[PDB]
Amino acid sequence: HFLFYTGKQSYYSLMHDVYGKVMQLEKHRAESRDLIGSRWLIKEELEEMLVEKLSDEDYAQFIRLLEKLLTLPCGPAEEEFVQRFRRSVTI
Amino acid sequence: AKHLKFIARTVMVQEGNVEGAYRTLNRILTTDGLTEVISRRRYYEKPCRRRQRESYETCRRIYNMEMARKINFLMRKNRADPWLGC
Amino acid sequence: SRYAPEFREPLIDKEYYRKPVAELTEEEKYDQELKKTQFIKAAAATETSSVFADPVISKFTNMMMKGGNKVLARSLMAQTLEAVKRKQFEKYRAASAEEQATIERNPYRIFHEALKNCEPVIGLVPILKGGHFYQVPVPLADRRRRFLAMKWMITECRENKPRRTLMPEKLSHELLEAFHNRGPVIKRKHNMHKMAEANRALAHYRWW
Amino acid sequence: NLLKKFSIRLRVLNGLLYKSLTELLCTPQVSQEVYDLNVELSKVSVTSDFSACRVYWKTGVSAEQNKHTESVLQRSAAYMRHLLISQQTLRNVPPIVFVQDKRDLVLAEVDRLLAEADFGPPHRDASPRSFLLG
Amino acid sequence: SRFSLYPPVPGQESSLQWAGMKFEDVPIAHIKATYNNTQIQVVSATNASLARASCGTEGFRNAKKGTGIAAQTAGIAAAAKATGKGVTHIRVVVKGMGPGRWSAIKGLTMGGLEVISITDNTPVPHXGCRPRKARRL
RNA sequence: UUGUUAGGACCUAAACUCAAUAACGAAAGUAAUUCUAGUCAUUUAUAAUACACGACAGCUAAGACCCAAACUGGGAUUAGAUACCCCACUAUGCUUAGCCAUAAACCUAAAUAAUUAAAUUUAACAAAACUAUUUGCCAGAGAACUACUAGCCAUAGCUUAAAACUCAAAGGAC
Ligand SMILES: [K+]
Ligand SMILES: [Mg+2]
Ligand SMILES: [Mg+2]
Ligand SMILES: [Mg+2]
Ligand SMILES: [Mg+2]
C-alpha cells in the first residue's frame, strides 16, 4: 500500500478517500436527514473496520470529515458511503 | 495659589448626575498621572529605588506591547480550517 | 441505591394524566413525551392516588415512628385526629349559634394551620469563634422551617406530659392549643426568634 | 535578555492590606474596568506562612455579574501587588488571591426575615573483582 | 449646542445661571478627605462660613471616623445646616484622596443640596517638602 | 487646635508633568527658568614616588531651619522585644569658609585597533566568539579589609601589608 510508511495505512487511506469526495462535491457546485435514529459508529467499531488501533483524536477527526461530507450536496454514491459508518441506534 | 480658582481640575455636572461628574474627574486625574503621583508621594522613595522601578516599568511596557503585537499579527490566521481532513 | 440515576420519580397524580392534552402546558407536555422512553421508579408502598392521603400528615407519622413501627405510628396519628374531631364536636354542640360559626371541626385543617403557626422564619446555628461558641442568625429554608415545626411538636408531647396521659391525648391538646397561637410550642418559636433579635448585631460571624 | 528576564503582625498586615487595596479599587489606577466594577472588600486574610493573601470581595446576586467580576479581579491581582510595593505600603507582599464572600447577601436576608418575624406578646558487586575472576 | 464639561470662564458672559445665580456666586462646599477624618465646610462665595461638619462631629470615633459611611453622615449633616441657612446649589471643591472623598459628596446630595460642579484641589508639590520615610511592615 | 481665606508676610528647603527621554561629564555626579564664562585639534595604547578631583556618612567655625530625621523622651506591643508601629524633638540633610578620602565607587566587563571566517556552545551561567598591542594585578584555604613598618589637618581611621600556625580541602556555575 502506498501509505505503508505512515503507520496507519488503513486510517489514512480512508481519510484520503473521504477528502477526495469532499473536494469533488465542493468543486461541482436539499434536506440532509436521509437517515434518522442512527448514530456514528463508536471508535471500537471503527477500529474493527480499519483493523488497526486508533486514538481518540483520530476518531474525532474522522467524524468531522464525515459530517462535512453530509453538509455538501450528496449523490446516491455518497449516501451509501456514509451509511457504512452509520449504525442503527438501539430502539 | 496665585492662579485663578475653579479653572483647574473642574468638571461640570450634567443634569444633576453628580456621580458621573466625579467618575469623569477621577479618569482625568488618573490619565494625567496625578493619582499615582499623590499615592507615591505619601512616603519618600529613595533615588536608587525610583530608577529601578521606572526602568522595570519601561521594560515591562515594551514586552507587553510586543506580545500584544504578535497576538494581533496572528489574529487573522485564526479562522476555520480550510484543509480539514488532511 | 438500586435505582440507576436514569430513573425518574413517579408521578401519582390521577387528574394530571386525565387532563385534556390542550390543558397541559408545553413544558408539562414535553415531560410526558420524554418520559415515554425513560425508566420510572416503582411507587412506594405509602404512595397512592387516594383522595384522603395528605403528604404533611404522612410525613408527621414517619417522624413519630420508632424502629419501623408504622402501624403504631399511624394508629397514634389516626387516634389524634379523632381525638381532635371529638373535642371540637363537644365544643360545637355546647356553643351558641354565633359561637358555632367560628368553631372548626375539620381535624385536617386544624393540623395544617397548627403546624404553620409553629414554623420559625429565622434560625440560629451554633458556631465557635475566638474560643467561645457564638451562634448567629440564619435564614431558614422551606424544608428546614417545616421540619422544625414538626420536630418541636413531637418532642413536647413525648417528654413534657404526665406519665398516665397518652400521645393521642397530649398531641390533640397541643395541635388545638397551637392552632389558637397559645401553646408551648409557639413559645419555643418565640424564643428562637427572640434570641435572633438579641444576636442580630453579630450576624457577621458566618462563613457558610 | 528581555525574554529571559520576563498574631499581632498578621493583624497589622491583614488590616493594612485591606486599608490599601480598598483605595486601589476606588480609582481607575488599576484599570477602568476594575473601577467600574464598584467592588467592595469584606476583609483580607494573610496566611501564617505568608505564602498567599486572601482578598474577600462582597459577592452579588447575579452569578453572571460575579463571574465577570472574578475574572477581571484575578487578572489585575498581579498588577495590584505591584502597586503596593511601588507606593511603599509593604516591602514584601504575597501573591494576592481573590476569594468570594457571599455573607453580605445573607446579612441583608436576616434583617428582612427578622423584621417579619413574630416575636409575640411581651562494594564487591560494584567492583570488577567478581567479573575478573570469571 | 452641547454641554461643556469645562467650567464657565470668570470675567465673561454666559447663559448658565442656577436659581438666578451666576457660577462665581454659587456657594462652595470644601471637602477635605483625609485617610482618618473627612471634614466638610460650606462657605458663601464671599468666604463666609455657613455650615461645618466632619466624621468626628457626628460622633464617630477613632477607626470608624475614617470610613465611607462616616463621611456620608457628615455630608448629610453639613447639608442640613446649610439648607437651613439658605443654600440650594453648591460648588464641591474636594481636597484630599481619603476614603470619604466620594461619600462626602454623596451625603451632600442626599441632604438636599444640588452640586453643579466638582473641583479637585489635592496638593501636588512640584519638586516641595521631603515626605516621611516609608513604613517598614 | 481645626477648616476656609481670588488676605498679609517670608523666599527656608526641594525642583511634578515633560522623562514611554538616554543627553552631558574623567570619575563622583548632573534634568525649575534666564543670562555670563565654558567643554574643541596631542597618530593611538601605555604612569607614579607627582598634580587635580572624588556620592553618602563624619569633624571644625559662623549661619540657616520648610520638611525629613540617627538618636533621645512619651504611647502601644507581646510569653518579653533596646525591635517593627504612633507622637515630640535633636545630630544631621542646606549655606559660606577648612578637613575626611571611603562605597556592590559595579555595566562586578582594564584601555585601544581589528575580524565574523577559522566547517569555532570549546565547561556552565552572564554579555556571540576570537586575535593583536601596552600596563596593572593574581599564584590552595583559614590565620588576615589582621600584626608590624612607612605616608597622611585623619588619633577607633585611611592607604601599604606578613609570619608562626593548622589543615585537604577552600571556591564557582548548574
Ligand atoms: K519609647
Ligand atoms: Mg533657596
Ligand atoms: Mg555665553
Ligand atoms: Mg535641626
Ligand atoms: Mg612588617
DSSP chain C: --S-TTEE-----HHHHHS-GGGS-HHHHHHHHHHTTSEEPPPPTT----TT--HHHHHHHHHH--TT-HHHHHHHHHHHHHHHHHHHHHHHHTS-HHHHHH----HHHHHHHHHHHT--SEEEEEEEETTEEEEEEEEPPHHHHHHHHHHHHHHHHHHSS-SS--HHHHHHHHHHHHHTT-SHHHHHHHHHHHHHHHTGGGTT----
CA–CA gap between residue D128 and residue C85 (Å, rounded): 104
List CB contacts (< 8 A) between D13 and chain E.
Answer: 137
Residues B34, E122: C-beta atoms closer than 8 Å: yes
Helix (H) or strand (E) holding D71: helix D63-86
Intra-chain end-to-end CA distance of chain C, in Å? 29
Q: Are C141 and C125 in contact (CB under 8 A)?
A: no
Cell reading at E88 = 440650594
CB-nearest partner of B12 from E4, E109, E133: E4
Residues D113, C122: C-beta atoms closer than 8 Å: yes
Q: Are E122 and B34 in contact (CB under 8 A)?
A: yes
Which residues lie across from E39 on neighbouring strands? E32, E54
CA–CA gap between residue C115 and residue A14 (Å, rounded): 71
CA–CA gap between residue B18 and residue B21 (Å, rounded): 5
Cell reading at B58 = 519601561
Cell reading at E94 = 474636594
CA–CA gap between residue D46 and residue D50 (Å, rounded): 6
Fill in the amino acid letter for E48.
A
Tell me which chains share at least 3 CB pairs under 8 Å with chain D: B, C, E
Nucleotide nearest to E45 (CA to C1'): F6
Fill in the amino acid letter for C29.
K
Fill in the amino acid letter for D24.
L
Q: HEC string of chain B?
A: CCCCCCCCCEEECCCCCHHHHHHHHHHHHHHCCHHHHHHHCCEECCHHHHHHHHHHHHHHHHHHHHHHHHHHHCCCCCCCCCCCCC
Q: Which long-range contacts (CB under 8 A, 24 or more apart) does B78-85 make?
A: B84/A64, B84/A65, B84/A68, B85/A15, B85/A18, B85/A19, B85/A22, B85/A61, B85/A64, B85/A65, B85/A68
Q: E114 φ, ψ to 5°?
A: -105, 110
Residues E99, D22: C-beta atoms closer than 8 Å: yes
Query: Is residue A46 classed as helix, strand or coil in its secondary structure?
Result: helix
Q: Are E87 and E51 in contact (CB under 8 A)?
A: yes
Q: How many residues does this entry show for chain A?
A: 91
Fill in the amino acid letter for C64.
M
Q: Which residues are CB-neighbours of E125 under 8 A, at least 6 positions away?
A: B41
CA–CA gap between residue C24 and residue E133 (Å, rounded): 76
Q: Which residues are CB-neighbours of E114 under 8 A, at least 6 positions away?
A: B16, E18, E88, E89, E90
CA–CA gap between residue D33 and residue D36 (Å, rounded): 5
Is the CA virtual torsion C176, C182, C183, C187 positive or negative?
A: positive
Q: D19 φ, ψ to 5°?
A: -60, -30
Cell reading at D127 = 567492583
Cell reading at D129 = 573483582
User: Mutual orientation of helices C184-198 and D103-116 as an angle, nearest 10°?
Assistant: 130
Q: Which of D78, D84, D83, D82 is nearest to D96 (CA)?
A: D78
Q: Experimental method for this entry?
A: cryo-EM
Q: D25 φ, ψ to 5°?
A: -90, -5
Cell reading at C57 = 400528615
**Cα angle for residues A33, A38, A43 (degrees, 5° grid):** 125
CB pairs under 8 A between D and E: 17
Q: Which residues are CB-neighbours of D111 under 8 A, at least 6 positions away?
A: C200
CA–CA gap between residue E57 and residue A13 (Å, rounded): 87
Q: E132 φ, ψ to 5°?
A: -70, 160
Q: Are D39 and D80 in contact (CB under 8 A)?
A: no
Is the CA virtual torsion A50, A56, A61, A63 positive or negative?
A: positive
CA distance B20 to chain A (A): 52
CA of C196 to the centre of ligand 5 (A): 89
Residues D88, E135: C-beta atoms closer than 8 Å: yes
Q: Which residue in this structure is represented by grid cell 415515554?
A: C36
CA–CA gap between residue C81 and residue C57 (Å, rounded): 10
State, as a whole number of angstroms, the distance between the CA of B48 and the C1' of F58. Answer: 23
Q: E125 φ, ψ to 5°?
A: -70, 145
CA–CA gap between residue C156 and residue D114 (Å, rounded): 25
Resolution stated for this PDB structure, in Å: 3.2
Q: Give 3-state DSSP helix, strand, coil % of chain A, rounded to 5.
A: 60, 5, 30
Cell reading at E60 = 464617630
Nucleotide nearest to E135 (CA to C1'): F85
State, as a whole number of angstroms, the distance between the CA of E47 and the C1' of F6. Answer: 10
State, as a whole number of angstroms, the distance between the CA of D128 and the C1' of F166. Answer: 39
Q: Which of A74, A62, D16 is nearest to B85 (CA)?
A: A62
Q: How many residues does this entry show for chain D?
A: 134
Q: Which residues are CB-neighbours of D38 under 8 A, at least 6 positions away?
A: none
Residues B41, E5: C-beta atoms closer than 8 Å: no
User: Mutual orientation of helices A56-71 and A76-84 as an angle, nearest 10°?
Assistant: 160
Interface probe for D, chosen from C190, C191, C195, C202 (most Cβ of D below 10 Å), is C190
CA–CA gap between residue E6 and residue E117 (Å, rounded): 10
User: Mutual orientation of helices A76-84 and A9-28 as an angle, nearest 10°?
Assistant: 150
Q: Are B50 and B36 in contact (CB under 8 A)?
A: no
Residues E105, B44: C-beta atoms closer than 8 Å: no
User: Mutual orientation of helices E101-110 and E68-85 as an angle, nearest 10°?
Assistant: 40
Q: Are E54 and E72 in contact (CB under 8 A)?
A: no
State, as a whole number of angstroms, the distance between the CA of E129 and the C1' of F12. Answer: 11
The HSE-up count of residue C85 (CA atoms within 13 Å, CB side) is: 10
Whether residue E99 lies within 8 A of chain D, CB to CB, comes out as yes
Q: Are C175 and C111 in contact (CB under 8 A)?
A: yes
Query: Is residue E94 classed as helix, strand or coil in its secondary structure?
Result: strand
Helix (H) or strand (E) holding D100: strand D96-101
Q: Which long-range contacts (CB under 8 A, 24 or more apart) does A79-85 make?
A: A79/A34, A81/A18, A81/A21, A83/A35, A84/A49, A85/A40, A85/A41, A85/A46
The sheet carrying E114-120 orders its strands as B10-12, E114-120, E89-95, E28-33, E38-43, E49-54
Q: Are E114 and B16 in contact (CB under 8 A)?
A: yes
Q: Which long-range contacts (CB under 8 A, 24 or more apart) does D118-122 make?
A: D118/C121, D118/C189, D118/C190, D118/C193, D119/C190, D119/C193, D119/C194, D119/C197, D120/C186, D120/C187, D120/C189, D120/C190, D120/C193, D120/C194
List CB contacts (< 8 A) between A68 and chain B.
Answer: 84-85
